[PDB]
Ligand binder design. Structure first.
Ligand SMILES: OC[C@H]1O[C@H](F)[C@H](O)[C@@H](O)[C@@H]1O
Ligand SMILES: [Zn+2]
Length: 472
């Protein structure tokens, strides 16, 4: 049967199912309703930066249509909705003056979700630093971000926290560090060779440290000022793609483990254990910032749950560890990516070239976190796959590959949960086709099709799959 034995009965009691978007990717009204620009507004308006020179000015226009989209998610039997608050929609300059019109939007959205029985899971940050903070402070290179972020978070807790009980601070700080400061392909476009300046060997580590310190500061403020009255929770969202040793050799197994540590351990070892991974300390040395004992104690235990964004898996091949002049966070891992084993690719690709369909990577990642980090509460905060540009409406709707994707990946998640993994929820990326960053509107991740000419929504087969699987 097309559900493949899946239903709410196949998951733990009270397990949360939801869909996910982010502010810049779906809201539109980017320069309206009082919103100030983010670093993504500037980046996307520069010719050549995004496919088709497209941008999020209008996006899906969820800003005007949010009640349609909430009605849709309820009709599809979801329990929850993960979305983000745009920092610059609340504080156009990132600090100081509050944009009351922006505040009213999120109040209206939160209130409608609750009216319709959908639980809001709210991200404070999703790639969209206010441009004013980038220019005035240097963004995530500046340790002052901890204070700036805490003040923003404090405002959101005070204003929405009587209703919002499930918060996340950040989304994928690894990708900000990697693409923003190592490879220089996302804003602020910093890297050793880059026109904007930078240093691919140092800046990614500075940025990660500042995200951890900022997360910890915001959580400390929540716990000391707001938690007694509000009785909510705050976590963080981290990307994790699986790494599998190419062979059982000592060096291939070590390579795969080095990649896990440089990928997820970079954040989880501080958040769970209060220190960076030993291998990162060993290889990165004085380029890796040191937490003071006090900072380490603030960071440790500061996530009430761990959001994992999970998509794909890679084979890893090793090498003898070498003394090397530092060049980048990427080169620091000393690993070799391989995309086939025994003459077979690890999986077929979706539309995005990085996205190999490997359902067992979901099991890999979840099992790994369970066994290594004392089985922390995990929420799968994004998982999904994309269709290419230029299909007909009917072709978008008949998304049989995405149906197969969710069935297989959720079957693997079920396997990990049935073995004891403490997973509390699962969220599909995305509710809607939307603005896919460098790919603009050429990549379609939604379970609901969005016609970008007319802005009409049409549920795809995968939406109806969820509706059938999730019926109460
Ligand atoms: O690449 C697909 C998707 O991956 C992650 F979930 C990011 O948080 C999203 O912003 C992005 O659109
Ligand atoms: Zn509109």
């Amino acid at each position: 049967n097309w559900l493949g034995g899946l239903s709410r009965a196949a998951f733990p009691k009270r397990f949360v199912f939801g869909t996910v978007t982010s502010a810049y990717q779906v809201e539109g009204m980017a320069a309206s309703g009082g919103r100030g620009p983010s670093i993504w507004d500037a980046f996307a308006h520069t010719p050549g930066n995004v496919a088709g020179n497209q941008n999020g000015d209008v996006a899906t226009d969820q800003y005007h249509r949010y009640k349609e989209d909430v009605n849709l998610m309820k009709s599809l039997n979801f329990d929850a909705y993960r979305f983000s608050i745009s920092w610059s929609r609340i504080f156009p300059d990132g600090e100081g003056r509050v944009n009351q019109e922006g505040v009213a939007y999120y109040n209206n959205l939160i209130n409608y979700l609750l009216q319709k029985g959908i639980t809001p899971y709210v991200n404070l940050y999703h790639y969209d630093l206010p441009l004013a903070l980038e220019k005035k402070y240097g963004g995530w290179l500046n340790a002052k971000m901890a204070d700036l972020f805490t003040e923003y978070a404090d405002f959101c807790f005070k204003t929405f926290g009587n209703r919002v009980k499930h918060w996340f601070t950040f989304n994928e700080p690894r990708i900000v560090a990697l693409l923003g400061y190592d490879q220089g392909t996302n804003p602020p476009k910093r890297c050793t060779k880059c026109a904007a300046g930078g240093n691919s060997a140092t800046e990614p580590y500075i940025v990660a440290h500042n995200f951890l310190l900022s997360h910890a500061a915001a959580v400390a403020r929540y716990r000391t000022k707001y938690q007694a009255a509000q009785q909510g929770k705050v976590g963080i969202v981290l990307d994790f793609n699986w790494y599998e040793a190419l062979s059982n050799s000592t060096e291939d197994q070590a390579a795969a483990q080095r990649a896990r540590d440089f990928h997820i351990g970079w954040y989880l070892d501080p958040l769970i254990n209060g220190h960076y991974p030993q291998i990162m300390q060993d290889l990165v040395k004085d380029r890796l910032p040191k937490f003071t004992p006090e900072q380490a104690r603030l960071v440790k235990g500061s996530a009430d749950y761990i959001g994992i964004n999970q998509y794909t898996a890679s084979y890893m091949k090793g090498q003898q560890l070498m003394q090397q002049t530092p060049t980048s966070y990427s080169a620091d891992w000393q690993v070799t990516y391989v995309f086939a084993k025994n003459g077979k690719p690890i999986g077929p690709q979706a539309n995005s070239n990085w996205l190999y369909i490997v359902p067992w990577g979901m099991y890999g990642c979840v099992n790994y976190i369970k066994q290594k980090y004392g089985n922390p509460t995990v929420v799968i905060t994004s998982n999904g796959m994309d269709q290419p540009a230029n299909l007909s409406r009917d072709q978008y709707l008949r998304d049989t590959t995405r149906v197969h994707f969710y069935r297989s990946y959720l079957t693997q998640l079920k396997k990990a949960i049935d073995e004891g993994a403490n997973v509390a929820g699962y969220f599909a990326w995305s509710l809607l086709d939307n603005f896919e960053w460098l790919s603009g509107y050429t990549s379609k991740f939604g379970i609901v099709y969005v016609d970008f000419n007319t802005l009409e929504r049409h549920p795809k087969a995968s939406a109806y799959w969820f509706r059938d699987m999730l019926k109460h």
